[PDB]
């Protein structure tokens with residue numbers, strides 16, 4: 001039923017896929033969260049909706065967010081009344097922005113990672129581009145290739161309308177790309193901008209208002225490869241296990257639609273409840289596979305900060321000690337919810353802080369760790385990581 | 392710099408990624424190409440555009456297409472005048488159709504693939520869903536998973552807004568999922584519906600008119616795995632080499648923009664020209680990596696994305712292929728039109744079946760080796776080197 005087998009025509013690698021560099025970028029406009037409700041109701045000309053703004057100030061005060069970064073600013077929003085409305089035909093001006101600026105922010109994040117990596121751009125064999133912010137043909141993967149001047153034969157994978165869990169997905173994608181191809185070096189870019197999602201307030205769409213309180217802009221970039229070249233490339237985290245779960249009883253929990261008015265956000269179930277009710281089973285299953293067993297307090301944690309109640313309720317249900325989510329909270333406070341890019345920001349802070357505090361390893365002390373993405377399905381992406389030792 | 396190595400935690404497979412099953416599906420409405428211009432100019436209130444209709448009749452006549460299948464029909468279009476115009480805000484009505492109908496049609500093709508495969512669907516470990524028709528959150532990958540009742544823990548990969556080259560991308564994607572994961576069985580689904588792209592004619596955007604003559608609807612699905620179970624699973628094609636290339640001097644050749652008027656289609660360079668000048672360089676590099684320092688193009692089987700007949704004609708001319716090589720590619724174009732990322736899988740299925748039918752030596756018309764090519768925006772050329780299986 002088969003011709004006689006031949007050796008793998010495209011050689012594969014032997015070690016684990018390894019993070020060799022991380023770079024991050026954010027748009028230049030900074031928004032204090034504690035005064036953001038004033039700005040938001042000013043720029044949306046909705047100061048007559050008194051009770052709604054009180055509701056929004058509470059949302060912002062309870063977000064665990066201190067500041068956010070956005071491509072949008074006061075000048076740009078005055079120029080587009082249709083994006084300041086809650087529900088006006090927009091998509092076209094929104095697309096005109098994000099199809100340009102999402103590859104641009106990704107390039108700034110990627111240039112940093114390429115620079116830290118140290119190798120020539122020409123060594124990049126694969127490009128994985130992940131966003132939730134607009135679509136186009138050719139995609140932001142093609143645009144990033146041109147902007148960076150990678151070789152025209154890079155193998156690309158364009159991930160559009162992904163959502164918050166895709167920071168975990170890209171790790172699972174790059175794992176197989178890196179491990180199945182000897183010498184493959186994968187450029188992974190997550191890049192998100194709220195220009196598709198910013199909109200005016202409505203008294204009957206309070207979940208849309210939660211989104212206005214939480215979503216920020218940012219781009220993160222990693223170089224993934226297996227078999228790092230000793231004393232030339234420098235490892236930081238190893239990918240050893242990945243898993244995907246549609247959580248029980250979660251149908252319709254989070255929906256997002258791309259419409260003539262832009263991208264709309266819909267909350268319809270207790271998202272922190274469903275995650276925290278089911279996270280025990282998922283991680284226990286992963287740990288049996290990887291180990292078959294360290295404590296949850298003895299591994300490092302990169303958890304997507306969908307919002308603070310997620311991190312809070314996982315922490316309680318699993319009875320974690322409060323430093324386990326500290327790095328994930330650090331990014332949420334410093335940046336807000338940047339959809340897919342969040343976890344890669346958290347990974348970078350983890351390593352930087354572990355180095356700077358002169359700890360044993362890249363993951364704040366521990367040999368093993370977790371990276372968790374959450375979003376729409378309701379989808380939980382699971383990554384078991386190993387760190388590297390340090391001085 | 393590293394912790395002590397440990398054995399790979401997730402076992403890998405050893406053989407090549409193999410196609411184990413193919414199924415396809417189309418919407419139920421058939422449109423004869425020869426009289427399609429009469430239907431199209433009438434439904435878009437364009438009967439007065441007398442010379443434009445004569446041009447469109449020529450496009451249809453020279454299209455190499457006999458018929459297409461479409462989810463759209465007469466009743467659906469009359470219910471949506473904003474779609475029968477050239478440039479009205481529609482995207483919402485277009486999304487309402489395709490976010491439901493794309494996973495639906497893919498479900499149809501996937502059930503056929505799974506039935507041929509013969510294994511329990513619970514043994515599917517990965518889902519790759521590929522489309523250029525609509526986007527949604529959660530995606531068509533999620534909806535397909537629910538419709539089929541696959542395991543809740545499948546590893547899903549959602550590929551939106553891909554374009555015509557993506558039939559080769561999913562093969563490339565599926566190669567690494569299957570090979571790096573022992574026991575992985577990947578369901579790959581490409582599902583395309585013209586409801587995103589249909590629009591009335593304009594005398595000044597004849598490239599938009601070109602799309603209206605060529606694009607059809609369809610979905611195709613494959614089961615891809617490595618290390619097949621002897622006597623249980625049946626290999627049909629192996630994936631041995633994958634390559635990707637942005638062709639030189641091709642910026643702007645094919646653009647597609649998702650707007651408030653829906654998906655718009657633009658052609659601003661000689662696309663069959665650019666592909667045919669460069670395909671030799673592309674295929675020569677792939678063959679040198681597979682075979683060293685090498686069969687002739689006439690001695691392999693061809694699965695070429697039929698973006699239009701001029702592409703197949705100009706690759707046939709410049710590479711001096713005998714005319715039989717593109718025949719399978721042209722048969723699918725004839726019977727279905729250009730189904731974006733779904734076509735090549737339709738051509739793959741057609742190839743195997745007529746090889747079995749005519750009792751040829753292999754599943755790729757008696758050749759051992761062959762190509763699957765996808766052409767699209769970028770200009771992106773995706774290259775796959777396949778091996779067939781022998782036949783009794």
Ligand SMILES: CC(C)(COP(=O)(O)OP(=O)(O)OC[C@H]1O[C@@H](n2cnc3c(N)ncnc32)[C@H](O)[C@@H]1OP(=O)(O)O)[C@@H](O)C(=O)NCCC(=O)NCCS
Nearest residue numbers: 446450453555597598601658662663698699700701702767
């Ligand atoms: C060329 C093709 C569009 C139609 O067949 P064709 O026989 O070449 O048409 P001919 O050139 O013989 O006929 C000429 C008329 O057709 C129309 N036409 C054909 N291709 C056209 C194009 N790219 N743009 C505009 N008009 C076109 C024109 O109106 C032309 O007359 P013009 O002088 O007014 O432009 C088709 O076979 C093809 O493959 N074209 C490009 C491939 C493609 O479309 N790829 C889709 C990719 S995802």
Ligand SMILES: O=C1C[C@@H](c2ccc(O)cc2)Oc2cc(O)cc(O)c21
Nearest residue numbers: 163164192193194197216256265375
């Ligand atoms: O509606 C949006 C906005 C989007 C987004 C966030 C940050 C950013 O920078 C750009 C886009 O994030 C989301 C993530 C989801 O899981 C579901 C959603 O509906 C959305």
Ligand SMILES: O=C1C[C@@H](c2ccc(O)cc2)Oc2cc(O)cc(O)c21
Nearest residue numbers: 554555583584585606607647656731
């Ligand atoms: O504009 C379209 C239509 C789309 C399409 C075709 C058939 C179908 O059934 C659904 C969508 O295919 C494309 C493929 C491209 O590379 C570029 C494009 O602009 C387009």
